[PDB]
Amino acid sequence: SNQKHIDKIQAVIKDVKFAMISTSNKKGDIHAWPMTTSEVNLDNKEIWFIGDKTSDVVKDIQDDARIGLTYATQDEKNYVSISGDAELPTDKAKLDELWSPVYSAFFANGKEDANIQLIKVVPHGVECWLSG
Amino acid sequence: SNQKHIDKIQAVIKDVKFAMISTSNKKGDIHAWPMTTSEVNLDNKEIWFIGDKTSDVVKDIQDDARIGLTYATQDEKNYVSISGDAELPTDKAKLDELWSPVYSAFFANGKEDANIQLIKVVPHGVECWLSG
């Protein structure tokens, strides 16, 4: 929570295509979904995703903001587990910053699309197993 | 919970070196650890690991048996998320079946070592994202 391998961890996260974000539902069960990380700044304690308001992950976060992210590199040599609190902000300014031509495709009404939901993860702990 | 891509999913799990097992701690936070799957039989609703009694994952499971497993293939083309209930049995018969020369190494007193803890995951839901 207050120390570093941050350099290499952020390196590992930029390398991995999909985070597995795990959440707990009203019955307390854990489920995960793969998602592409839009931004990772560990010094500012911020991991950002662009989600859908209709998604299960957003549904679960609305009742329980305590989430987990995990990242595995394709060489199977590096793993990261983050424990964090997920927020559901509306921030046009921020959405603009995170926007790509990928998203302009799969969101019928672009940056004004009602289904867009930014997810801000504020990590409070990070464990990792790096090689080597 | 009552249907199949079980064939290919078990195939995907045999292919992946480490599951990320996520658990929730007394404060409700989620944390994950990488672990090698000792056995996967989805028809019998059984995923087995050999853990350590001193481990955090076992600690968390003792108070909250509701866990998550995720598996990502190194080609980044296949992902599996399992929601499950973890049990902490003592079963010599079963330990014998799951035993390898790897474990004989890193457990000072072998199959009689006090630190051994079998973990049985009984899945109740599986989602996956396969290609393609």
d(CA B87, CA B108): 24
Buried b (16+ CB within 10 A) or exposed e, B27-61: eebbbbbbbebbebebeeebbbbbbeeeeebbebb
Q: Take residue B76 and report the two structure tokens written for it.
A: 């980044």
Count Cβ atoms below 10 Å from residue A47 Cβ, excluding itself.
Answer: 24
**CB-side exposure of B32: number of CA atoms within 13 Å?**
34
d(CA B76, CA B131): 9
d(CA A81, CA A117): 23
Residue B95: C-alpha distances to residues A93, A126, B48, B87, B112 (Å): 56, 32, 10, 14, 10
> Where in the sequence is the domain holding B7, given as residue range(s)?
1-132
Positive or negative, the CA dihedral A9, A12, A14, A20 is negative
**CB-side exposure of B10: number of CA atoms within 13 Å?**
15
Contact B3, B126 (CB under 8 A): no
Contact A31, A53 (CB under 8 A): no
Q: Does B111 touch chain A (CB under 8 A)?
A: no
Residue B64: C-alpha distances to residues B30, B59, B82, B107 (Å): 11, 9, 16, 26
Taking each continuous run of H as one helix and of E as one strand, the counts in chain B are 4, 7
Q: Which residue has the tokens 């931004």?
A: A39
> Domain total for chain B?
1
A22–B29: do the CB atoms touch at under 8 Å?
A: no
Quote the minimal CA–CA distance from A81 to chain B in Å.
6
Beta-sheet strands, E only, within A42-99: 46-52, 66-72, 79-87
Residues of chain B in contact with residue A28, where contact means CB-CB under 8 angstroms, are 24, 64, 66
Q: Take residue A72 and report the two structure tokens written for it.
A: 């595995």
Count Cβ atoms below 10 Å from residue A12 Cβ, excluding itself.
Answer: 20
Method of determination used here: X-ray
Q: Does B55 touch chain A (CB under 8 A)?
A: no
Taking each continuous run of H as one helix and of E as one strand, the counts in chain A are 4, 7
Q: Which residue has the tokens 């899945």?
A: B123
d(CA A54, CA B42): 30
Positive or negative, the CA dihedral A76, A82, A86, A91 is negative
Residue B86: C-alpha distances to residues A18, A52, A118, B126, B127 (Å): 26, 31, 33, 15, 18
**Can you give the CATH number for the domain in which A23 is found?**
2.30.110.10
Quote the minimal CA–CA distance from A86 to chain B in Å.
12
B81–A125: do the CB atoms touch at under 8 Å?
A: no
Element at B101 (helix H, strand E):
helix B101-105
